[PDB]
Design a protein around this ligand. Sequence first.
Ligand SMILES: NC(=O)c1ccc[n+]([C@@H]2O[C@H](COP(=O)([O-])OP(=O)(O)OC[C@H]3O[C@@H](n4cnc5c(N)ncnc54)[C@H](O)[C@@H]3O)[C@@H](O)[C@H]2O)c1
Ligand SMILES: NC(=O)c1ccc[n+]([C@@H]2O[C@H](COP(=O)([O-])OP(=O)(O)OC[C@H]3O[C@@H](n4cnc5c(N)ncnc54)[C@H](O)[C@@H]3O)[C@@H](O)[C@H]2O)c1
Ligand SMILES: NC(=O)c1ccc[n+]([C@@H]2O[C@H](COP(=O)([O-])OP(=O)(O)OC[C@H]3O[C@@H](n4cnc5c(N)ncnc54)[C@H](O)[C@@H]3O)[C@@H](O)[C@H]2O)c1
Ligand SMILES: NC(=O)c1ccc[n+]([C@@H]2O[C@H](COP(=O)([O-])OP(=O)(O)OC[C@H]3O[C@@H](n4cnc5c(N)ncnc54)[C@H](O)[C@@H]3O)[C@@H](O)[C@H]2O)c1
Ligand SMILES: O[C@H]1[C@H](O)[C@@H](O)[C@H](O)[C@@H](O)[C@H]1O
Ligand SMILES: O[C@H]1[C@H](O)[C@@H](O)[C@H](O)[C@@H](O)[C@H]1O
Ligand SMILES: O[C@H]1[C@H](O)[C@@H](O)[C@H](O)[C@@H](O)[C@H]1O
Lengths: 366, 365, 366, 366
Amino acid sequence: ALGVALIGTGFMGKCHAMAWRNVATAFGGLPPRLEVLADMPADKAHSLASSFGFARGTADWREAVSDPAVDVVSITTPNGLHREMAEAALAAGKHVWLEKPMALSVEDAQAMEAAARASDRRTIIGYNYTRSPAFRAAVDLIAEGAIGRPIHFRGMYDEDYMADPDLPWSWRLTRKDGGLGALGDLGCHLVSVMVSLMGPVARVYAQADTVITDRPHQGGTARVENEDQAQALIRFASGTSGEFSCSRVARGYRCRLAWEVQGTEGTLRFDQERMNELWLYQPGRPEIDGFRRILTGPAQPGFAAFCPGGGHNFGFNEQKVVEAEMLRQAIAGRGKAWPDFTDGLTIERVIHGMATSAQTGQPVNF
Amino acid sequence: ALGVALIGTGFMGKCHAMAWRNVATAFGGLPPRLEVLADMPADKAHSLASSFGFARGTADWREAVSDPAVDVVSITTPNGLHREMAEAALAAGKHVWLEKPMALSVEDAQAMEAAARASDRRTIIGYNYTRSPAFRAAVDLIAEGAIGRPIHFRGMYDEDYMADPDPWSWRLTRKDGGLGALGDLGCHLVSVMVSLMGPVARVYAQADTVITDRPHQGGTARVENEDQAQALIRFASGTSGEFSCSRVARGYRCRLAWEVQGTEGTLRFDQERMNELWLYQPGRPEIDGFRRILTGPAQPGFAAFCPGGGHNFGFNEQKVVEAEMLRQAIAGRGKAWPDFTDGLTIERVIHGMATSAQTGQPVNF
Amino acid sequence: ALGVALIGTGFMGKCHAMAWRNVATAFGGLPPRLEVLADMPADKAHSLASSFGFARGTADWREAVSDPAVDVVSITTPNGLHREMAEAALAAGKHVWLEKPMALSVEDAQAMEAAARASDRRTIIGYNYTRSPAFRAAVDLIAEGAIGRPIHFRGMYDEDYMADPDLPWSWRLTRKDGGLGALGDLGCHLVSVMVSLMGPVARVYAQADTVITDRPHQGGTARVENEDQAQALIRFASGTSGEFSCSRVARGYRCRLAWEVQGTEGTLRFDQERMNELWLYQPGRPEIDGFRRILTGPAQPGFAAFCPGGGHNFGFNEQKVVEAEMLRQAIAGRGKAWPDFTDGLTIERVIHGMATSAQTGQPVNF
Amino acid sequence: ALGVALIGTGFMGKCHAMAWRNVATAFGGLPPRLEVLADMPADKAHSLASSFGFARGTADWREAVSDPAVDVVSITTPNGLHREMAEAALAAGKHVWLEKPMALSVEDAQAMEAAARASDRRTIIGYNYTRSPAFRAAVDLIAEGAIGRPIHFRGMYDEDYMADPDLPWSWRLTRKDGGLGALGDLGCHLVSVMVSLMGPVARVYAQADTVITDRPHQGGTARVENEDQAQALIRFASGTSGEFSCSRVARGYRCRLAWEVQGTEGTLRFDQERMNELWLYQPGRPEIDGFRRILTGPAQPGFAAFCPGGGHNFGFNEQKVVEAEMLRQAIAGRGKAWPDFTDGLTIERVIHGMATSAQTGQPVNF
Ligand SMILES: NC(=O)c1ccc[n+]([C@@H]2O[C@H](COP(=O)([O-])OP(=O)(O)OC[C@H]3O[C@@H](n4cnc5c(N)ncnc54)[C@H](O)[C@@H]3O)[C@@H](O)[C@H]2O)c1
Ligand SMILES: NC(=O)c1ccc[n+]([C@@H]2O[C@H](COP(=O)([O-])OP(=O)(O)OC[C@H]3O[C@@H](n4cnc5c(N)ncnc54)[C@H](O)[C@@H]3O)[C@@H](O)[C@H]2O)c1
Ligand SMILES: NC(=O)c1ccc[n+]([C@@H]2O[C@H](COP(=O)([O-])OP(=O)(O)OC[C@H]3O[C@@H](n4cnc5c(N)ncnc54)[C@H](O)[C@@H]3O)[C@@H](O)[C@H]2O)c1
Ligand SMILES: NC(=O)c1ccc[n+]([C@@H]2O[C@H](COP(=O)([O-])OP(=O)(O)OC[C@H]3O[C@@H](n4cnc5c(N)ncnc54)[C@H](O)[C@@H]3O)[C@@H](O)[C@H]2O)c1
Ligand SMILES: O[C@H]1[C@H](O)[C@@H](O)[C@H](O)[C@@H](O)[C@H]1O
Ligand SMILES: O[C@H]1[C@H](O)[C@@H](O)[C@H](O)[C@@H](O)[C@H]1O
Ligand SMILES: O[C@H]1[C@H](O)[C@@H](O)[C@H](O)[C@@H](O)[C@H]1O
């Protein structure tokens, strides 16, 4: 069994834990051994290792990535910590499951990518919205020619977690430790999905905005630095056109990663807030012509490992189980995992390229 | 930590396995120990006990219920085994997580309800559709007066797994399944309905078998029970109700959809979109209409799985919540619903409906 | 050109006026001659006669009905006035376009039916939800065998126009002017749709409720004389099962006439609040299997006469234009108007049979 | 009564006819007298003038614009004739209801604008998607402060009427006729809506494609000369951002003019294919937080003129009756008609500016 370390226990830390714990339940093989949990403070690491079923808990992550019983390290700590912990893991000869985005900057991502290439260990970044059965059915459909040649992509990713202007400031909202705003938190997820459907991005023209430029900082106010929303027009390497957006201030949306691929012979549309539906249009006779609602079931990739009956809604967390497995297969030498630090660095260059574009009012070519 | 035995590894068996494995991960406390898994043949039981992380797999269910390390038994076998397995598990001093419906008959459920009181062990029936954050949110809203006085209920549960020509399940026999759509789906619809409306007083029902033989069985494969059924309800309150279920309603996969029309509002839900609760309350005319409430941390259960609203809660995660309730009842910190007593009433409703359909007569409770 | 008389100018009266005005615009032939309009008081009739484009107004309907420049009469007055007005019109040798339901009782409907047969004039009842391109396409699809044989019908008609208890007492709530409550006002519509799709009703078992027992009336407090809601289980002459309901207190719904036909080889589903969509499931390959959203367009009956492009939503009022056209054609002998007073009589026996079942607690066979 | 001439009887011609016959029926006043109808050949004009309720049909549009009994002229002919016809109507001192877009080029629009100012006659351009009860409710909800300050617009207009590559090379596909492609046919309508929500446009950056470049043409094939789809990033004069697209080859879509405004305090979203629904998000307590589905009814502007009860879906064609009313009110010197040829000119510069941008690869500033 694969020896597992986990660093962090928050939103993603718990998600990885629940995933590791059931990956063998779903897909077979041996359950991974949950060796070490790292979080701060110590008493919290001990508590959570107990209730997560980990063999021990530590307040010292370096110990976790060092442990001889570990082969793989889940890294679910804040973006400013990714580079250091990732690199230390790879140097200790461990495979790495790293949360997105890779780091704060393209330069950090590049350093990490070089580390990974040296190491010969397997890596994967936590672009979990590419794990849904519906998204994977969509990719297969386009490959099968269900919509002919793609002629346009339109995608968005709206959430409203920062829309309230009273929400307190933090260094996340600075360029340092924070990095990009909406592009770094959400943009990257959209790019991960978009390039899987349409191929590599050849060019972007973008614009960005900070809507809420000043926030309470225990007293007066602090200037928010990164962007609350960004949009971009795209040209892919195939030459086809695309539209792109992201926002952390789009009121009423909670997880609205929504995309569509219009093709010569059809159209596919999807909204993550209803992650179990794939809308497919193909030309038919006039009398019955129209979009089909394909409800996620065992006909789609990965679904049948969790449930034999269609229409039993596949959940967000279960995406993470599929991700664990893809890494599990890569480590077992049986299948390449996407995206690794090399694949992820391209995604980093895209979102940062869009940021550069926005600042300059000039298109950026990749 | 609770010792767990699991009987069955099919649709619901595998579901219970995933739930027991993550109950503590979501809700804290100590993770349950996965002790014994039972299924046939033995080779299958062995491989799956290993992948599911169970200490052993066996082809002998009695071995699972008698393991001293076990405190609780998940029974996920065909309906025709529920009674024997549940009564054995109770007599063995184990708490029971029994899959719905209880058994083949009301008499069976009567026997099991008596045993459950005698055992002084906790019981819960697998009505996992009452565990969604959206559903739990609805109940709380109604109790708050959000929709005022419930004046009508309209409920359905449509699926189409029997509509497919390609097959043969135990669900189609009287000795393995019992009732057809009413036993396999109807009961779920009842569990939801009485949780919203209070107990049933009267039913008038009708039923049909639309596919009499399983096309690809070689031999005769007579469907021994109903493919669909509908009923008018009167609740103990005096309120009206519409009820139906079907395993042949083509294009539906898990369409357990209900609504409660109140004097002050309406609540509506469809399990195919289990993350949405529609709420209408009267407002200013210029902004009047139903609200799509997207499941999130403000709903019961959800926060334990995710701090961000809109990250769709899953079918399988309803089962994690179900497990947590049994586990809280087991610790004397809550009361599990429905136990074998509450479940008995449910069996009466669906079997009353089946009777009403057989006789062309109303049935009172 | 056909000579028109119109009695009433409210909800349906204005609908009828608008329909006659554009019937020839839509379908060709000669525009009807808008001859006489009748409403009270007189000032109101002459005023609306002017704005509706009618040659004259009057406060006395009887004159309008026997005016020799009139060939057809639209009757859009409360239910209590239907029988008298229709019987008078027919006996003058005029065709009649009558608002639903026929009158207060089954006896009224039998009286009206007899008068119509003796008069040898055309009649049509205003069941306008049978006139939508989506509905008519549904009936055709069933006929062509798109969903095999029907095995179940589930229908409802929810509105909340009496859901607020403060709303004033109105004629729809009296047995003298309305007759039945939600069964008379909404239920009849549901039946007209249901029988078009499933065939005749063989049996019903029903229950009914008055949720708001009293209402403000000028001074205050008046008792509601008929039902706010009703439901019924149906057996059709075919043997097939049905579910049926209606309500005027169903909070949040405005025109939710929603039905579905579940067949052996597919399913059809419709909701009048989205009267441009017809949902059709037929079995398909697993990977693309699901309900189609058919958007109303020129391939559906009647639509091409209003617009040559699909997706330009056909409206409520245009159903009435279709309805006038079917009446014109019938009067000219080139078509059948459905439902006439005879077909209308059947509809009335169903709804009153439901009322009876509700009162007795026993099934009612037809 | 207003004297009305109508030129053209097709898609919009017939829609204008239906609108002029019921404008008074809906909003009171005197019914406009339908004087002259022009279309070709003559026999068709005679036939349709009879069935449209027009006093006479003619094959010569110039006759209609000069008739002394005419006060206002509807112009529903292809784009290349708009300039000529409008300028002539105005020269004869007639009021003008002109179909979109104004013409083939900015230059044309400039001349027509000056022509319009030179006469002292009313003009309105046929941007009917701004007449819907839902849209007008949206605008008033914003003006009422419903969503705070707009911070982003996302708009699209997808149709597939050109998706089939075997459709014959026809007028919307030419420069000399047609002008722009998707931008001139669908884009303009999106801008009409967009500037009504976000105000004027400061800057665009756009991309465009011809996806089907060749089409059957009398035993041969001809080159398509304008775009099938276009997209743009927008910077509004207010400093706010926007996304914009249109397409005539977006498979499955029939009239998908969908738009969204995300504000500091709320969100509004709309889709013409369901023109009777308006989605509104305002912050609520978390228990009941979410988008409201607002079903078009009497609370929304214009609706009560057509129907006293909500839910009775307002049609595409009834947008035009509203448009007619707005014009009658402007002629009567009450309400002003938007957009006139001056507001229209701006919309033309925008769509042509996107076209320029897409052609050159450069941002275009206004
Ligand atoms: N893939 C996805 O869908 C997704 C979703 C949410 C967050 N994320 C990513 O997950 C990462 C964490 O996000 P989150 O929402 O879980 O943040 P969080 O604040 O919920 O959790 C951070 C975790 O890291 C721990 N931590 C912080 N500093 C530490 C240190 N020095 N040593 C050990 N532990 C430390 C915290 O105590 C906590 O356990 C971020 O990189 C974010 O981008 C990804
Ligand atoms: N709550 C739910 O949503 C849900 C879903 C599916 C089934 N169910 C209920 O759960 C139960 C199981 O249904 P399922 O769909 O998982 O059926 P299934 O056929 O998929 O699984 C049944 C399992 O029981 C095992 N089994 C059969 N006979 C056995 C024996 N003699 N000893 C030990 N194991 C035996 C089978 O080998 C199989 O592993 C039924 O009671 C059903 O009504 C509930
Ligand atoms: N088919 C449909 O979709 C539809 C929709 C709404 C109403 N209806 C039916 O239309 C009919 C009228 O409904 P409504 O909502 O228009 O009612 P309403 O209250 O709007 O109008 C009643 C009309 O009758 C007139 N009236 C009353 N007494 C009269 C008399 N003695 N002489 C002349 N005119 C008289 C009133 O002045 C008014 O014009 C009813 O039978 C109702 O069932 C049908
Ligand atoms: N606002 C909308 O929703 C909408 C919808 C469709 C079209 N349009 C616009 O309406 C206009 C017409 O498009 P359509 O789809 O109605 O085209 P169409 O081809 O359906 O009809 C064109 C009409 O113009 C007539 N015509 C052509 N040359 C003429 C001449 N010399 N004299 C008189 N009549 C002549 C044709 O006979 C026909 O009646 C275009 O400018 C288009 O952009 C707007
Ligand atoms: O598919 C159905 C349904 O999904 C229920 O959840 C399950 O309990 C039934 O046994 C199964 O037959
Ligand atoms: O709003 C309702 C309903 O829309 C019916 O169409 C109409 O016939 C009723 O009389 C009216 O009350
Ligand atoms: O079908 C399209 C579109 O629906 C618009 O309504 C119209 O203005 C266009 O000209 C027509 O091409």
